[PDB]
User: What shape does this take?
Amino acid sequence: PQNGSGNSTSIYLEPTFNVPSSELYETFLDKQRILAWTRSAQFFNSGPKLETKEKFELFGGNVISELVSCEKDKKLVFHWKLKDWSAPFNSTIEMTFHESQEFHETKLQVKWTGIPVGEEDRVRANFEEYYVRSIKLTFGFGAVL
Amino acid sequence: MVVNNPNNWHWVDKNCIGWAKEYFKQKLVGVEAGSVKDKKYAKIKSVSSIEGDCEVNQRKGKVISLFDLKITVLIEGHVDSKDGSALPFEGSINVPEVAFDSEASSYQFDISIFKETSELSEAKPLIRSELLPKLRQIFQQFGKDLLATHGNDIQVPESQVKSNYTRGNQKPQNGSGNSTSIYLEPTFNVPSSELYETFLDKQRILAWTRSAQFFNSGPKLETKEKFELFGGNVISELVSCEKDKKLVFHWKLKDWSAPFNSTIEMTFHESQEFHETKLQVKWTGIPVGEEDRVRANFEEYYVRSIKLTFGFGAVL
Amino acid sequence: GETFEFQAEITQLMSLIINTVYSNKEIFLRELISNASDALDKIRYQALSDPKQLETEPDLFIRITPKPEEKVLEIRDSGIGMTKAELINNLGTIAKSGTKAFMEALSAGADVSMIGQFGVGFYSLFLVADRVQVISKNNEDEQYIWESNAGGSFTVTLDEVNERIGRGTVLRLFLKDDQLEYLEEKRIKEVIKRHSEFVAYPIQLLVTKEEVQELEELNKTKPLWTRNPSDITQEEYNAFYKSISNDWEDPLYVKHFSVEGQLEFRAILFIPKRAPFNNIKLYVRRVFITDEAEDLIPEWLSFVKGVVDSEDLPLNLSREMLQQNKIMKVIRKNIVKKLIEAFNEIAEDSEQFDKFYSAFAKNIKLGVHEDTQNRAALAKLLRYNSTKSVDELTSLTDYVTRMPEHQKNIYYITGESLKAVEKSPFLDALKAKNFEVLFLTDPIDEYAFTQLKEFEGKTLVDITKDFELEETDEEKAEREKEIKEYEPLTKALKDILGDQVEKVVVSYKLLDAPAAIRTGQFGWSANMERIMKAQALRSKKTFEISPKSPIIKELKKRVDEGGAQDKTVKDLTNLLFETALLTSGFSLEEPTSFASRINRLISLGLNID
Amino acid sequence: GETFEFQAEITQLMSLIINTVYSNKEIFLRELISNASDALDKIRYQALSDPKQLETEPDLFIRITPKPEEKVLEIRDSGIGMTKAELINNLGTIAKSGTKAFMEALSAGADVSMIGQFGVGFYSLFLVADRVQVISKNNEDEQYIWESNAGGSFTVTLDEVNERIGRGTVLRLFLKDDQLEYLEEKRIKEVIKRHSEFVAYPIQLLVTKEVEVQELEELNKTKPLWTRNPSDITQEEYNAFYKSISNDWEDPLYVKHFSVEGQLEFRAILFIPKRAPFNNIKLYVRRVFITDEAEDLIPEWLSFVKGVVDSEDLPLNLSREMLQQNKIMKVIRKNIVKKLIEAFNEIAEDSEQFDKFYSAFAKNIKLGVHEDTQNRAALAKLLRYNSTKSVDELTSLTDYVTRMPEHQKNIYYITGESLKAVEKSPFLDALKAKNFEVLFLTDPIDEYAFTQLKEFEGKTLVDITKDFELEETDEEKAEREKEIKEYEPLTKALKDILGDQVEKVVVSYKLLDAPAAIRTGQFGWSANMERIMKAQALRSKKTFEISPKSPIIKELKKRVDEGGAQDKTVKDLTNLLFETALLTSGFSLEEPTSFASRINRLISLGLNID
Ligand SMILES: Nc1ncnc2c1ncn2[C@@H]1O[C@H](COP(=O)(O)OP(=O)(O)NP(=O)(O)O)[C@@H](O)[C@H]1O
Ligand SMILES: Nc1ncnc2c1ncn2[C@@H]1O[C@H](COP(=O)(O)OP(=O)(O)NP(=O)(O)O)[C@@H](O)[C@H]1O
Ligand SMILES: [K+]
Ligand SMILES: [K+]
Ligand SMILES: [Mg+2]
Ligand SMILES: [Mg+2]
Assistant: This one.
């Protein structure tokens, strides 16, 4: 046995946001809106919004993300990786939108794969704080108590 | 005491809050500042209160002590006068804390002189000249003797210890009970004008209580008048009251027996400097097994209930 | 390979039970009182088969006589007692429990539930005493003395110098110099009230009064969970509630149930009359274990009082905490299920539910926001005012009963008080169509309605936000013709306000008010935005005008005359916009500017140049 | 008479020590790693005096090899090992701690920090394992096998069927059928990241990848920083340490590493995060996690800080996850708050760093002024607010008294909803004329702190929203008394119209441009406090004062002498000025529909609508 790393695991979250799929989709792409709920973002391109195959650092540079595929208010797939993570470890998070016009809500089905075994509970609790509750309190897309 | 600790390896605790009080009752008193023949003199007569922690512990044979007490004393004496002989005066010395690792320059002294006048300006340099160095050496010596008298009570002698590591670290019929009394001072942001009528006006009493049964048709409460509160479980009677200064009630709970009847004494201490009022409540006559129950409920049914119904202070 | 056996280092194991466990030192009184109750149960079980055993000392009691003169805490009971052999085996061997050995030798279906199962509870008195003098007396033996100094050896001497007792055991606790607090009446009654308050046998305490000494029974209120809820009267429940909690008032409702099977446990849950703003204590073998269980009661349901007396709970060596066993969740769902059934029984009464809802309105609505499994059951208890229920409160099920056949949504409105929502201009639209609108006055109402989202198929719709109503074929063509006519007026109000509003549209849901502001059915409401901006521990607007108001018609006349950029039309636009914010529930930014506009209208009315 | 010796029931003591001591079942992994760390310290202490004792196994590691197909959780260490006699005396006897006897054999003052002190920590593995096959190997003996199943007896057999090991002990755990969760990679890493994260020796874990070669991963990748001097530690090491003690992603805003030496030996590395987490301070004894639910360790208002506290010497419990009657915590509580207050003062010396700290923890600092009393004066100097002279940046209370003129004896402030509402309030015109600075309070928690301080360097905190009296010359008091006496029927007219809406109507000179305003009667809830209490989810009389210099008030006075005390047109205007003053003073307007009807009638009057 040689010195290496562990395996990978997966999670599945579904936070409910009170915002149409058109406005919520632009929240994860508009750089002017990203700085609102993140309070710190570093973009390398001069584009107004995020594009395909574009890397950008979040939360002081500790969170490295990259948009690899996205649909019109339907799909959002990002390559999520942490600063303290190793080189082979690189997770990919998928965001699927489901607009419910009867209740005026949007259940964002989040299919996150490629998370390390030991780093599972860390990226799940902080996702509800830096991504779920941060947007609900900045843009008013949900009641938090 | 008998301590069953082989080689003195486990933590054995010994509370010394009782012995600490008796030690200060024989060391802080009797010490004087100057002499009676001089125009300036002062001497501590008694200790006001000794509150805090004073315990000795041992881990691996070394007697450790992490005491932290709040010492306050009463001081008398006299100062120089322009006309006639010297005039006496009274005061009090307040110490913030006396720790175990406190140095000589760390001990603070809050000077509290009664009846402050311009003639008594020389009273503060008096205690700071000879009295304060006498109190510093006593507080410093308090840590030495505390490890000397209670240190041998634990850490059994080395004759029975076979550990070199610890050795190198050593240097009637059926009846009822009696009563008791409690004392609290809740703060209210309200003058004594309406705070007095809060406990008397029946229309205002029903506000912060939401349940009351008055037997008389009077507008407000009068002397020698009984009334039940909280569904008839609280039976109190107003027997004496002054104009916005004193309130005496005969508090009694329904669960209490017949020979038990407590008495509440409320005193108003409104200060116009901060626009507040400290209601000193001297509650006596409570059973010994009921003083914690009526005290925790007084902060909920009497203190917070008034500050939330009428808004006599913000609580968070 | 040689097969050895496990040994035990007595000189070190004794210290492991003396000054390494029992974090708190008051536990010695509870375990000694519990040891007296087990001895009283042994002699009581033998009295049913042999009455001669209870003839020496027929009165069963537990006497505690403190002696501050010689620093001796004497605890005497009239139990079965210990013989000379029991003092060496049952009281001289670590982890040897004679009580557990007596329970395993009983018959099938016994009514006695003893406490002693571990066998190391007797060595807890050494926390406050340096040496103990146990005086025992059995029927089939003589009276002996068990003396020990917490060391590694003890002595058993025949009692010939102390007082002769009939039957039982006397424990003389020579308290230490630092543990003299247990010689006063305050600390004695404090530990008993906290730990051994519900002992089946009376606990007598020798109290000196001001030198006439008397005996007081510390446990005055017998436990009620061992009895059927049928024969328990109302005044017994009131006295029991005032003992488990320090409350002075009587309990509003009592929910006493019993679950049988593999998790037999008793629980008497009390609902107080006022909010206490843990509360549910846990009892095992008539002994208080702890009350810090966080998974036993939900956070929104933490207002209920009472105790839970279970029997199958894995306790630690100190009997002050519970180990993880995946069983508290079963007791958790049973408590909520019985309390929800209890809340439904309170709803059957009108006077009883009025006091419960008015005192715990925040707690019931908090469960709708937090709990999800029983969210529909808690919605049945929600009571609010409405346009047809301005006097009393109505439920959600009564709302659907009064809904017409052409209504498909539950309409409500949020605000700061009842007077603000009753005069809101958003009610004139629904009152014309005979639509009932609920009134939400508490700040927590919006947090509950944003999680339910549906009641019996009816979607909860807030009239404060933007929504749509039904309209006939004759009106849909008239409204479209009037909207396109007022199109330049909507654009005239947009550039004046600018970023203050999202869009200016002509709305027909206004009859008396000339203008109003809505949220947009996706953002935070006017009340929700005001709530978040006022919490100590912690949206776009739509300008809609009424085309039938005379003020709006006059503003429309100024547009076609080239008055889109006049000074007077800009003053009235900002005035009407900020006025609608006060009616819709919004807060005015820089209220000094709004007051300056009103002062200028006052001068115009007073003929001031 | 007869003296006997205390005995022990072995058949029943084993059940009590194993089943009824530890709350959780995952504690078994912490004791086995702690025992491996103690054995590694024994061979390390002997390597300094005998290098040949470390030649058989020079690598000091802790390897864990889970086997799901065999239901075996193997824990191998390279410690000193146990001889044939130690497997019977040390490991065979309950409450016999051989590592404690090793600590007592050396002299006082060594560099040993072993964990084993009780002697009943080894039996905790039986909570999850049915039978054990602990294999040991010492340098001064052969390799033996210690087999037991907690049945009151054990056997020691010479090892001849297992692989030869150099030095150390191999712990073979045959887990039960219901405790098979400890064979996966997830459950193993959770216990290590919770109880034995900061072990000085590397903890190796054998994981199995997918096609599927098995490798070794070091679980404790971060080394403890409290064992090093805070001067030698750089900023990069403090950031990685903060990401290990907590699950946060960002770097710590400030690091406070101190160490108290004396009667109480304890170290603490406290981190200040960049955002509020809305416990947090963990306690470590012998570099082993004990508990994190200590309430007497850190105040609630100060619980926002992160970090751990190394307090190697403390009274531990038999379960070893709770402290006994913590009187030492009060000494550590006062030391942690003292060091954090001194740390907050060091942040206040900077300008760019304190802006991020105050903007993120403004509520926590003000909560200390409301709750804490002994350290209320120290926290009052950290409060930063806006004022009429500090509209750009936040100013402190110390800088406030510096700019105070010689004729000012009180600190003036004002509360409200936001900054835009308090900056244009009509209450500032009186203080701006006398060159008096007024602080601006925008957060709802500001009022709860000012009603508890009540004094800052002898200056009394006064709220301009309440009824207060200013100082003026004697000739001004004479001319003002005539105007109040002249406007006496005007004040009596406004009182009967409003009724019980106000307590009294008086002529105030603290208003310059506004026609009227509303103040509180110096007791009760203020305008902002009353609105906040009526808006909490989990949860006073008014004074009508007019300005004698406003043209509207002078016109209303002209109507009084003409018999217009009961005119219909005046009653509408006095009610209009009252509800308008409530909006400017910060009061909640009752039934705004009627107030909107008055505005709609004024708009129609301006548009020539009959
Ligand atoms: N007051 C008493 N009268 C008679 N027998 C007693 C008395 N106290 C203790 N014993 C005996 O001593 C035995 C030892 O009990 P003890 O050491 O207190 O632990 P336990 O009560 O059996 N279980 P636990 O208290 O949870 O550790 C009991 O089983 C009784 O047989
Ligand atoms: N991995 C190991 N290698 C060598 N010796 C060991 C090992 N594990 C246990 N021992 C021995 O077993 C003895 C008994 O220790 P144990 O029963 O684990 O409790 P303890 O470590 O002594 N005290 P505590 O860990 O606080 O409960 C120790 O003194 C060691 O000598
Ligand atoms: K025993
Ligand atoms: K052992
Ligand atoms: Mg016992
Ligand atoms: Mg161990």
In short: Helices of chain A lie at 21-27, 31-38, 120-125, 127-138.
